[PDB]
Design a protein around this ligand. Structure first.
Ligand SMILES: Cn1c(=O)n(CCCO)c(=O)c2c1nc(Oc1ccc(/N=N\c3ccccc3)c(Cl)c1)n2Cc1ccc(Cl)cc1
Ligand SMILES: Cn1c(=O)n(CCCO)c(=O)c2c1nc(Oc1ccc(/N=N\c3ccccc3)c(Cl)c1)n2Cc1ccc(Cl)cc1
Ligand SMILES: Cn1c(=O)n(CCCO)c(=O)c2c1nc(Oc1ccc(/N=N\c3ccccc3)c(Cl)c1)n2Cc1ccc(Cl)cc1
Ligand SMILES: [Zn+2]
Ligand SMILES: [Zn+2]
Ligand SMILES: [Zn+2]
Lengths: 675, 44, 142, 675, 153
């Protein structure tokens, strides 16, 4: 048996008071006048009564939405403090307008002001009411601000500084307060949405709230642009410069993927991309394919035409964005094809020559190599060093170009210090020619791997290539766990087996290591142990490497068990864990896979619009009126968006049902009294 | 004192969240309309 | 329902105390053997009433501590009473959410330290939440 | 310019008629009285008018649900044909009650009858109104029926014979028509649910509709007994015998998994399972495990006690279902451990004897072998040959027991045909002793593999083991494609390579086949080719098997390409395809994994309740009142169920919005005319 | 580590399948055990360059079946010195059937359920991690154990 009693007592309501709030929804007022007039002397009923649920006399009238009782109570001097917020929160326009024409317990935090609460509800009509009067909302401080009051307020009382800043940004991100009372609604949504994204990392505790607010700003910018009704309106929005396609460059700069990938914006971009061919969409796939090598095969002819006569009609083709892309791809493909001939044009006779002169294939490689190096700094100079590292494909260029430069440096260095011919069998293991041939081969892989970046143009391999790299970043997170599991077992295996290292002389065919025909010394050194464990993932390490010359097969059994336990952890467990999450991470990416590809393709297209870098790498070496026009288009767009968004809201709940009941209850009472 | 304040805010917040339709609710509107219809008809 | 529950609490009202998880007294074993499907049903009905957030926010000395003990005790019942595991687990999550929602209403840093540093007789209350595996209570951003 | 015009013309409604339908929802009757009285002479208005949607005048009156204009129209002789079905479809009890007390276009198929439509709506109140009057529903024919009229009707007109049967079963499967007007609602749901499931295969076109109807009956039976409020009621339902736990056995026969797996039925079953231990649930896992081998270790003592004194208190322990399960498991586990000792208890001196006598371990295996064979016919006899073949585990018993019988037959046969001892190296390939040992080893695997069937008792390994085999059927269904892809490539590879077969003498160590140290003749014969392609899945086939002694490395290249293409298809494509569908089929099973496990464990528990087979295989060889009680309980369950689902129905829609519109408009006009 | 418990539950079925096939292969091949002296380089077992006696003893049979999961056991270990080409075929079919069950059937079964089990875990990943980090944080709050291990004394 558990007795139950009210633990935290609260003052109860009297019998005469309880009938007052019970009859508030009814519609009789003679009780109010009789009590209030007598309240000056009799003090029979306290009008400012407090219901147990924390609701006062005035707040009931707002809840049932009836304004007739509201007028009567406001006639007498009642405590109306913090009652405006309740009217705004219910989004009842009639109640608010009456209110401006005028510790305790409250349902709202002390930092809430009526303008902030109105923006939270996103009610256009109510927001316009308050903004007409002189109303201000405080500026939020910067993300990294160490002033005298930001530190003082945060240190003295947190959970309020963090709440106040979130509430301010909630009001600023409301589409109604941006479409109204903002000079450039599109630009404001761009800056605010980007700012909120950066704030989701600094304030990691409130990640969900700030990220949701950022998506709210992004949708508003795209929804505003969705209301364009003519190509004249679309061109004005995209070409507007606050200081072509100036506004589209800003959208790309702020990572507004939804704004860019809008179908109306993409159609305009495709017009400029396909400038030469007006009907490329309607062409057959066979004729589209066959015509591809037509420009590609004649790439040198157009390239030389631009140099000798830029104004000529034949030279007018090259600066068309689609022609330029084909010419650059064809020029690069010539480099890769001519690399394939570098491994078969060298005679056997000069195989023993030390520091050879450039061959018949390397000589024609040289102009291309200088073209890439000369063009590498140009794109680095325009964006600066900081912008360089962000692009993953841009790191490949620097590593590939450095290897090419190192190859040329070593080839000439060996050409001047060696003159005679010596058989290749007795060359030193760090021979400069050997190093140069190794670096040249490595860079050949990187050069051929850059063709993946061209998949973005195609509509089939595009989305798959983009989603391929988006899930790559999840793989690197697993590589940290494996690199520590591998290190843990490699250290143990090396420590057990290093007592039995043997010289290469005693080995069968004078060979030491795991790359011999008969593998041996697989765990002799720490460097060799890591290689042995890596190759065991692919099953290329034989089991007999766990034996030793002296038959201490208690040590051999321990080594075999340690090797066996690594296989279970790495292959059975860890490898299967990577498959499990990669499938899960693929479901999320596939939902937005179309938006990312269009954003990625837009960046690819826009690089060929400008006149700079129009020549292939082999040939690389030898004001106020527009403001008002934008304003009138924005005014029309806001009108359509406000009208449309208002009735998507109007297209049921428990509270809605009560209001019908109140009207029926009220209508019954006035009819009965009428005679 | 702090616990009492938290309970009051929690009760009010969850009360409002509750009221935010049902077929049984449709009958109540039907009943009130019919009750009003007969009451006025008897009235003269 | 907060309003209806409060009305009955004003009158002298009692709820029978459920017995311990591992109980073997004279009446618990006898009642179970003569009539099952009623011994188990009665206990489930009682724990449903005790786990009501409105019956904890009202008529309880420490609503946070009561939700901690009741929520953990119900979790242990989901193993012994394997047949009714689904019903008992939903009651355990009801008490875990109530503790998290109650302290989500803090409006200042001063209020938060009072709750978290309270000792029954630093961070004494936080350690109790960790002991009872109140993951949602601990992981709230405040 | 596409002109649009009326194609299929329909007679329009006159102006005076159009005013009628618009005013039908209003509530004026003087127009009706004047027109209908004048219809005898003037014929001004045709009351039985059809609106554009085919709604006759009376039909709208039912549509707004009001009973006033419905009453007045009924007074005059309006065409009421097929109007009763419309009232039933709206689930309005007032219209139906008044309507009963009295080619063209219809929304209902001509075979639909008022009782048939009432059961479709599953309205308890409306159905009872029609059942009170003499009402019958036609009997459906059997699934395999070839009478004179069933074939004749189905031949002359399909799409109607099938429609009639589905309509009939929809009415019969309604819970309101089963919970009411049925002698035994639980048994009726069991028979009807099973019969509908069997109909989902013959009528494969309508599989979706019949499966849903069958699931409806299964849920009703579980819901009906979910309303039991005391343990006394539960035993009455479960122990009822239509002609212990007789009703529960019927449920298992009809595959009522939801009915069996309800926690209330499981609690009663668990009480009988743990009869010996009243507090097993509250015991610790340490004491539960430690006490397991207590009965297990002393299992021979209890078994012999039963034989010598069935009435003794000590001999009654084995009769308890849980102790009997432990005793059988301990006895079976002895066999497997006794098999462990047969591989080392023979001496190295007797490996050269032909047809040896049974060894020091095979002698005591013999009583175990006869225990299973003697017990196998006993269980098969009870259910017959047909019942035996359904269980997958039963096939394992038959194969394992047959192999043991063959092992004994060959051992005794070789024991008498040979007497001298001859070295094993000179024995024939088909020596009787060699065949006997091969069969003994094969059956050893089957004996040990049967321990997986014991996982059903455990609560952790139970659900996983059940779900382990539910999607094993999909794997076997995938093995048909592989078994034909393997045949296609095996035929191709054998055709090319069979001209280069070499004798074993020419081989290095007189070894031929892929099982030698150096693999050779991997594709010489069809039998060997299939083995080579099988072992290539696991990577155990070396690449040099594609070479031939005569260096025709164009034939070798083609043969290597056949081998390469098989690997791509089988490993990259086919193997990864099996993984993808295996997970997809796992999600569906994982939802119901608990229900199937409880049904599977219930069958395991109920096998030990009977007194048959009490002793382990090593020791196998040396009446009208209950109808009133069940009827009273069934009546109480129906009343609780009917009330419960009625309130659950009351827990909005566009059509519900209309009556509120009708009530307001009807109230508006009557008050307006009132003075 | 949250789905490592699921893996441990699958290891019971495999360990029973492994014991079943290790029983049959050792029951068949134990008549042909050869001493280490007769071996090529005085080496016995599956860890030699030439693998031999892979199924001679029960302890070695379990090791042989384990290494066959990773493909480190050669196919010629199913041969015997005396050319009984019926025992070899039966022994090779026992080895082949084990590979199908363990690799094609059981391993794909483990992948399927872990893939399903990851979805449920991924929902509560943040809450579980924050609770785990809180315990780590509160361990360093107390003054006890302030000194690092090497300076504990
Ligand atoms: C780590 N390990 C090992 O290194 N070797 C090489 C020793 C050579 O000297 C062994 O043979 C060895 C061993 N684990 C062993 O049993 C286990 C086998 C698998 C296990 N899990 N998951 C799996 C998941 C997917 C697929 C396969 C496995 C676990 Cl958990 C244990 N066995 C075999 C064994 C040998 C003797 C005995 Cl009495 C019992 C068992
Ligand atoms: C069938 N096949 C083959 O048998 N051999 C061995 C013959 C020598 O013995 C080959 O080398 C051979 C070959 N297919 C070849 O290219 C393809 C390679 C992979 C392909 N798909 N999916 C894959 C899916 C997952 C993982 C890997 C592959 C396809 Cl569709 C084609 N290559 C290589 C090649 C050789 C010469 C040239 Cl001119 C071009 C390519
Ligand atoms: C178990 N097994 C075996 O051990 N060997 C080697 C023994 C000699 O050393 C065999 O060659 C052998 C064999 N199963 C065989 O066919 C099957 C092949 C695959 C099967 N399933 N799923 C698969 C799932 C995924 C991927 C691959 C397979 C099944 Cl169910 C049966 N074949 C080939 C064979 C040989 C001769 C003949 Cl007349 C018929 C077939
Ligand atoms: Zn500041
Ligand atoms: Zn008790
Ligand atoms: Zn018939």
């Amino acid at each position: 048996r558990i007795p139950l009693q009210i633990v935290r007592a609260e003052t109860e309501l009297s019998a005469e008071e309880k009938a007052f709030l019970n009859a508030v929804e009814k519609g009789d007022y003679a009780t109010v006048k009789q009590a209030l007039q007598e309240a000056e002397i009799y003090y029979n009923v306290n009008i400012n009564c407090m219901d147990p649920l924390g609701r006062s006399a005035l707040l009931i009238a707002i809840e049932n939405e009836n304004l007739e009782i509201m007028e009567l109570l406001l006639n007498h001097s009642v405590y109306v403090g913090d009652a405006l917020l309740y009217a705004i929160r219910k989004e009842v326009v009639g109640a608010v307008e009456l209110l401006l024409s005028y510790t305790q317990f409250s349902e709202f935090t002390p930092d809430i002001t009526p303008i902030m609460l109105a923006a939270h509800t996103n009610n256009y009509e109510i927001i316009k009411l308050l903004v007409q009067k002189r109303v201000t909302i405080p500026r939020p401080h910067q993300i990294r601000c160490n002033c005298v009051e930001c530190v003082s307020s945060s240190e003295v009382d947190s959970l309020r500084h963090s709440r106040s800043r979130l509430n301010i940004y909630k009001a600023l991100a409301s589409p109604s307060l941006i479409a109204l009372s903002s000079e450039d609604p599109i630009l404001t949504a761009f800056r605010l949405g980007w700012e909120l994204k950066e704030l989701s990392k600094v304030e990691n505790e409130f990640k969900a709230e700030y990220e949701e607010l950022s998506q709210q700003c992004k949708l508003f910018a795209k929804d505003l642009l969705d209301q364009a009704r003519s190509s004249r309106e679309l061109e004005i929005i995209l070409n507007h410069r606050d200081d072509d396609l100036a506004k589209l460059k800003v959208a790309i700069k702020y990572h507004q993927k939804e704004f860019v990938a809008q179908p109306n914006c993409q159609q305009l971009l495709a017009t400029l991309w396909y400038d030469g061919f007006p009907g490329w969409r309607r062409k057959h796939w066979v004729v589209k394919l066959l015509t591809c090598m037509t420009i590609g095969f004649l790439f040198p002819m157009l390239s030389i035409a631009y140099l000798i006569s830029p104004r000529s009609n034949l030279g007018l083709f090259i600066k068309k964005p689609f022609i330029k892309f084909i010419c650059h791809t064809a020029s690069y493909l010539t480099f890769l094809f001519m690399l394939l001939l570098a491994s078969q044009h060298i005679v056997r006779t000069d195989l023993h020559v030390q520091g050879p002169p450039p061959t018949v294939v390397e000589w024609m490689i040289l102009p291309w190599v200088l073209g890439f190096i000369w063009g590498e700094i140009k794109e680095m100079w325009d964006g600066g060093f900081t912008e360089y590292i962000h692009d993953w494909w841009n790191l490949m260029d620097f590593a590939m170009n450095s290897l090419y430069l190192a190859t040329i440096s070593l080839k000439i260095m060996a050409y001047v210090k060696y003159n005679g011919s010596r058989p290749r069998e007795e060359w030193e293991m760090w021979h400069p020619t050997l190093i140069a041939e190794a670096l040249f081969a490595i860079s050949n892989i990187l050069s051929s791997l850059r063709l993946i970046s061209l998949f973005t143009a195609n509509s089939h391999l595009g989305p798959l290539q983009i989603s391929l790299g988006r899930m790559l970043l999840d793989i690197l997170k697993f590589l940290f766990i494996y690199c520590l599991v591998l290190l843990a077992f490699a250290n143990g295996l090396n420590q057990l087996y290093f007592y039995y290292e043997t010289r290469a002389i005693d080995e069968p065919n004078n060979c030491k290591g795991i790359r011999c025909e008969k593998q041996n010394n697989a765990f002799s050194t720490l460097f060799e142990t890591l290689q042995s464990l890596f190759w065991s993932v692919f099953g290329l390490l034989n089991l007999y490497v766990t034996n030793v010359k002296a038959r201490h097969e208690f040590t051999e059994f321990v080594g075999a068990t340690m090797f066996g336990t690594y296989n279970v952890i790495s292959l059975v467990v860890l490898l299967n864990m990577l498959i499990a999450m990669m499938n899960n991470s693929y479901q999320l990416i596939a939902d937005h896979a179309d938006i990312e590809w269009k954003f990625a393709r837009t960046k690819l297209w826009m690089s060929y619009f400008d006149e700079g870098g129009t020549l292939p790498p082999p040939f690389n070496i030898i004001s106020l009126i527009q403001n008002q026009h934008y304003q009138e288009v924005i005014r029309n767009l806001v009108k359509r968006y406000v009208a449309a968004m208002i009735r998507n809201s109007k297209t049921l709940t428990e509270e809605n049902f009560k209001e019908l009941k109140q009207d029926i209850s009220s209508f019954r009472y006035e009819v009965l009294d009428l005679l």
